[PDB]
Design a protein around this ligand. Structure first.
Ligand SMILES: Cc1[nH]c(/C=C2\C(=O)N=C3CC=C(C(=O)N[C@H](C)c4ccccc4)C=C32)c(C)c1C(=O)NC1(C)CCNCC1
Length: 501
């Protein structure tokens, strides 16, 4: 249910308005043709027109399908791809991937197929597309149309862009409301941080830090920032809405308490992928506890809080005794200089708590003080039960290694070391990252569970819409499908004609 005159809100500007856009957008191929969703579509659409590039786009699609095919069925899929795109006389043949590469890939299919069979090919393809095809697209009407979309993307966002609903919960500096973009109809979570509260507590710096971390990360398993704006009396962050409850509720209210190992495996794998996306930005989370792992309508999880998150300067360590009792790694409790390691300690706490139905250092039915809990976290070796396979015991006691330098994933290799652990032996991360694994629980939709002194902080925070989420919103709500209309028979529409504004 969109607005009424939304076709007028998202009405394309005449291409003559986008000259300043044209002269400043960096013409990076990976950004304009892959990273940015609308750019990727417009470039692909440009290729659909030329017969010469059609086959190249189709091949990449098939290779994306191959990377995710189940193990037993790679040879069946690999052969198909080779007889359709790598045979010299096929109707859709990829020629810029020299025969010297088609012979090589035929060898790999003469042997056991790997999931990276066409990686060499696909790169040969992209290297060709970043050249002449990309620079033709840059002078095509589809790039002009991309500029029109960027012009819309950069429009100011205000309280009237959104339609507030209900207060979902509360936190430290404010509350979280449910909002809806009027023009598109997409739902979001409005994290309203109230102004007065940020000034009294002199915590502007860590609010900007949360907004910058949220906007820089684009993970399927962490809440994404779509907008950041200032209203009459607050500064709101527009975030992924999550209606499927949180992991604490499902461990204790819906659980035994606890989950079957396999169910916990799924959630752990997704949480691990969330942490890896954060760690790519050398950003440490430090707040991993079940109430911060939220579920969406489909059953997938995302890491939700980020107020205790900080971007570690590359090559440097941080210091900060923060977090929640019982979910602080020992190096944090000791107020030492650490890196990303607290997050893998947290991952250990989550996997343990999902399987056993209680924290590894605090019995569910135990009246204990903060001191004894912290003592346990620092000296006591946790125990396991028959709810854990040998593989589950291993990963947990490896992630719960007291010494932060002997702890799984805290090596130069990072998250990859954890994904290789036998506990994920039956987990195919390429299919999980692709969203092809059915979550173990699907929540029912209907279910319910003062001067210019500050102005400089306001401006750096209210940056407006975020590029990738915004374009994704346009695609999901089908605003793109509906507005991205050109002229009849590949002709040029008025909004892209410089001869009649
Ligand atoms: C729909 C929904 N969203 C959320 C919540 C979120 C969300 O969605 N995105 C996000 C992103 C980030 C946060 C986050 O950092 N906050 C921290 C604590 C915070 C800090 C400072 C100020 C305010 C808040 C929370 C959320 C909650 C609970 C329900 C909820 O409980 N909904 C029912 C009560 C009704 C029907 N569905 C399930 C139960």
């Amino acid at each position: 249910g969109k607005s009424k005159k939304w076709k007028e809100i998202l009405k394309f500007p005449h291409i003559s308005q986008c000259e300043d856009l044209r002269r400043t957008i960096d013409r990076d191929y990976c950004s304009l043709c892959d990273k940015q969703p609308i750019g990727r579509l417009l470039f692909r659409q440009f290729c659909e027109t030329r017969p010469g590039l059609e086959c190249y786009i189709q091949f990449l699609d098939s290779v994306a399908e191959y990377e995710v095919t189940p193990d037993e069925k790679l040879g069946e899929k690999g052969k198909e791809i080779m007889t359709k795109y790598l045979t010299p006389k096929s109707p859709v043949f990829i020629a810029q991937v020299g025969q010297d590469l088609v012979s090589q890939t035929e060898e790999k299919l003469l042997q056991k197929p790997c999931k990276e069979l066409f990686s060499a090919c696909a790169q040969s393809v992209h290297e060709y597309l970043r050249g002449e095809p990309f620079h033709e697209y840059l002078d095509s009407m589809f790039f002009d149309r991309f500029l029109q979309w960027k012009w819309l993307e950069r429009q100011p966002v205000t309280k009237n862009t959104f339609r507030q609903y209900r207060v979902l919960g509360k936190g430290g500096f404010g509350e979280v409301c449910a909002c809806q973009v009027r023009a598109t109809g997409k739902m979001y979570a409005c994290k309203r941080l109230e102004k007065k509260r940020i000034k009294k507590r002199k915590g502007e710096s860590m609010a900007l830090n949360e907004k910058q971390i949220l906007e820089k990360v684009n993970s399927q398993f962490v809440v994404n920032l779509a907008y950041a704006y200032e209203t009459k009396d607050a500064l709101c962050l527009v975030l992924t809405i999550m209606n499927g409850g949180d992991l604490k509720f499902h461990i204790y209210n819906m659980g035994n308490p606890g989950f079957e190992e396999e169910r916990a495996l799924f959630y752990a794998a997704e949480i691990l992928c969330g942490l890896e996306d954060l760690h790519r930005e050398n950003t440490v989370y430090r707040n991993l506890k079940p109430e911060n792992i939220l579920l969406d309508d489909y059953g997938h999880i995302r890491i939700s809080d980020l107020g205790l998150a900080v971007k570690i300067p590359e090559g440097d360590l941080i210091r900060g005794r923060v977090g929640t009792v019982g979910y602080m790694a020992p190096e944090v409790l000791n107020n030492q200089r650490y890196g990303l390691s607290p997050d893998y300690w947290g991952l250990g706490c989550l996997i343990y708590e999902m399987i056993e139905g209680q924290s590894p250092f605090r019995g569910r039915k135990e009246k204990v003080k903060r001191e004894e809990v912290d003592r346990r976290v620092l000296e006591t070796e946790e125990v396991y039960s028959h709810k854990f396979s040998e593989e589950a015991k291993s990963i947990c006691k490896m992630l719960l290694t007291k010494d932060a330098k002997q702890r799984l994933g805290c090596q130069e290799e990072g998250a990859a070391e954890v994904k290789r652990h036998p506990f994920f032996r039956n987990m195919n991360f390429k299919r999980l990252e692709a969203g092809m694994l059915d979550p173990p629980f699907v929540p029912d939709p209907r279910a319910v569970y003062l001067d210019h002194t500050d102005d400089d902080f306001y401006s750096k925070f209210s940056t407006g819409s975020v590029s990738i989420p915004w374009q994704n919103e346009m695609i999901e709500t089908e605003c793109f499908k509906e507005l991205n209309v050109f002229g009849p028979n590949g002709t040029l529409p008025p909004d892209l004609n410089r001869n009649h504004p």
